[PDB]
Amino acid sequence: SLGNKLSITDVKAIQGKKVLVRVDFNVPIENGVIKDTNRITATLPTIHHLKKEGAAKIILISHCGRPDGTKNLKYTLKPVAETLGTLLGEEVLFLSDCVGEEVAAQINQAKDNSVILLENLRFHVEEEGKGVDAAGNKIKASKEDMEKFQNELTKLGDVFINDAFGTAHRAHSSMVGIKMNVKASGFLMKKELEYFSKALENPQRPLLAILGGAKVSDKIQLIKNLLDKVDKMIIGGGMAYTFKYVLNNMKIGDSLFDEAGSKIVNEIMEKAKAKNVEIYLPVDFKVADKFDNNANTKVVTDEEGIEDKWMGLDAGPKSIENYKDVILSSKTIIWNGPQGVFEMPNFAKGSIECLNLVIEATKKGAISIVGGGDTASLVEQQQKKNEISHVSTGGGASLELLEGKELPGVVALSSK
Ligand SMILES: O=C1N[C@H](c2ccc([N+](=O)[O-])o2)Nc2sc3c(c21)CCCC3
């Protein structure tokens, strides 16, 4: 279950407690300078809530870069402590390690109600469970090593707040080994769980999945899992040409073709029929004579097909008109994939109309969730993030969740 997890807002006893908070501070750092502070800014509602509620100590644990289980100062979290301090308007204590008596002494000696950032968790092979030493030899933590490290992290505080949904798909020590009585989601994790639970667990129906992207192969697990949940599914973008070729022997010219994924198309269609799911593939396409925004273009239907040396780059006008009834009649929408080469403005029309229809359905009461990177990029480029119910920032964890995979960091939270 996703929606029955204890959240930071449910936690009554915070005043005077040492609160351990797992955060996502995996930010790009160039010569000690943080190039993108968004992940740090995103944690401010969690930190402020714990400050306002009077926690004795706010102890932040995280990782960044690729230390691979040994201390590698290239991936030190020291600059993050400086940046966070500036954003909070107070000094953030930075510690050289994340476990041990010295760390415990420094935390206890620190000013009441203050924020402490401990060193990169992944400097310890026990965080990921395996790594590579400096020489390049594979290293592995034994069961006992793992248990010791997790007991050392548990000893840091009294209450655990997991605000790193982006790592919750990993069975890592800070995700599954912090055995405090209260283990609750932070504000970021809380919103991720609340909206994915709304979408996948007893949703307001019809439930629609809008899938898109270049290939079929990397989306097989996602499609098959969503066919167990949804009422309707739009399949678009570059992956649609493989479907058109297999199902209708449509000529696709030089359009993308997924050789390995083509072998699975019938299984997917057979599963949608078995699950009583309505599939909506495009029936026309905007075709180009070159892979370029300034190519000569025209619209071709799925009956005409695509001539040799031409390529389909976006859904056609009839396909776009077909989105209206499908999207506007849906009460829950999970969108994971643009419907064309949106990076090229002339091939963005299908994805933009899809976005406008999703916004309209949301305004009328539908719950809209945007899953991954490219769709999130389109929403950001169009400046419409405030018009979608939830735009996930979970990256790999969001994709695993939608594929129906177990999220060990979510499983490890306390129940409500
Ligand atoms: O790299 C490519 N991706 C695009 C793509 C992604 C999504 C869609 N869509 O049509 O929606 O098409 N389509 C083609 S043709 C093509 C390429 C791509 C590479 C060079 C040869 C011709």
Side-chain angles (χ1 to χ4, degrees), residues 124-391:
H124 295 264
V125 67
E126 300 89 344
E127 172 62 357
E128 298 192 275
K130 65 158 79 181
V132 168
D133 67 18
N137 288 328
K138 297 163 85 174
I139 55 166
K140 275 101 183 76
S142 72
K143 185 185 169 282
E144 294 87 348
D145 294 331
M146 293 295 275
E147 289 171 326
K148 202 255 182 186
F149 182 66
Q150 294 162 15
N151 187 46
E152 289 302 314
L153 294 173
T154 305
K155 280 194 269 184
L156 298 166
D158 309 321
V159 175
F160 180 50
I161 303 296
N162 192 341
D163 217 17
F165 173 83
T167 303
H169 63 313
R170 310 290 199 203
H172 290 175
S173 282
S174 70
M175 290 292 108
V176 305
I178 297 165
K179 296 173 177 176
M180 293 177 195
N181 174 254
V182 177
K183 302 163 291 163
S185 60
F187 286 97
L188 289 165
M189 163 98 75
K190 169 191 193 201
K191 194 174 186 280
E192 294 281 6
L193 295 184
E194 173 173 349
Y195 279 89
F196 285 118
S197 175
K198 277 171 183 173
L200 303 167
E201 305 176 336
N202 299 1
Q204 213 205 316
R205 294 178 181 272
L207 165 62
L208 169 63
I210 304 169
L211 301 183
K215 289 148 187 236
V216 178
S217 287
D218 65 336
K219 295 217 157 54
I220 296 165
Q221 294 175 345
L222 172 61
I223 297 160
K224 289 191 164 176
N225 186 59
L226 289 173
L227 289 174
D228 285 327
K229 318 275 173 188
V230 312
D231 297 294
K232 303 190 270 221
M233 181 183 288
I234 284 168
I235 297 172
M239 57 193 297
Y241 304 100
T242 297
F243 278 78
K244 304 301 294 193
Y245 182 78
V246 174
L247 300 173
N248 299 303
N249 192 51
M250 190 186 86
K251 298 172 235 81
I252 62 167
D254 281 346
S255 299
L256 285 184
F257 186 74
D258 193 331
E259 298 195 323
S262 74
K263 294 165 178 189
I264 314 302
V265 163
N266 287 323
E267 268 170 49
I268 286 166
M269 296 312 293
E270 283 158 359
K271 185 171 182 177
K273 292 176 186 177
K275 290 282 171 161
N276 197 339
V277 177
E278 299 160 359
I279 304 303
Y280 303 97
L281 279 159
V283 293
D284 66 344
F285 309 92
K286 188 169 180 183
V287 297
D289 67 344
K290 72 164 55 261
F291 190 33
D292 191 273
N293 191 57
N294 246 266
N296 290 306
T297 66
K298 65 202 185 182
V299 170
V300 304
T301 64
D302 69 353
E303 182 55 39
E304 297 166 323
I306 308 179
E307 67 202 272
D308 292 357
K309 302 173 185 186
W310 285 66
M311 63 196 76
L313 299 183
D314 195 12
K318 186 56 162 174
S319 299
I320 290 164
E321 280 314 287
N322 289 345
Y323 296 162
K324 197 190 176 269
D325 289 358
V326 175
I327 298 172
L328 298 185
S329 71
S330 296
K331 282 291 165 186
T332 310
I333 303 163
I334 300 156
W335 184 8
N336 201 102
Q339 306 296 294
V341 186
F342 79 102
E343 304 102 314
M344 291 178 184
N346 288 322
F347 307 111
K349 310 197 165 104
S351 303
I352 291 167
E353 180 54 13
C354 183
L355 175 61
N356 292 329
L357 289 160
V358 170
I359 290 162
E360 186 186 333
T362 306
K363 282 171 168 163
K364 288 193 254 163
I367 301 298
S368 47
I369 290 111
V370 161
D374 288 356
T375 311
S377 298
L378 168 76
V379 174
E380 189 187 353
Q381 283 161 24
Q382 292 292 307
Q383 290 177 270
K384 304 284 173 145
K385 297 158 297 311
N386 288 325
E387 291 260 56
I388 302 304
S389 311
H390 180 64
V391 181

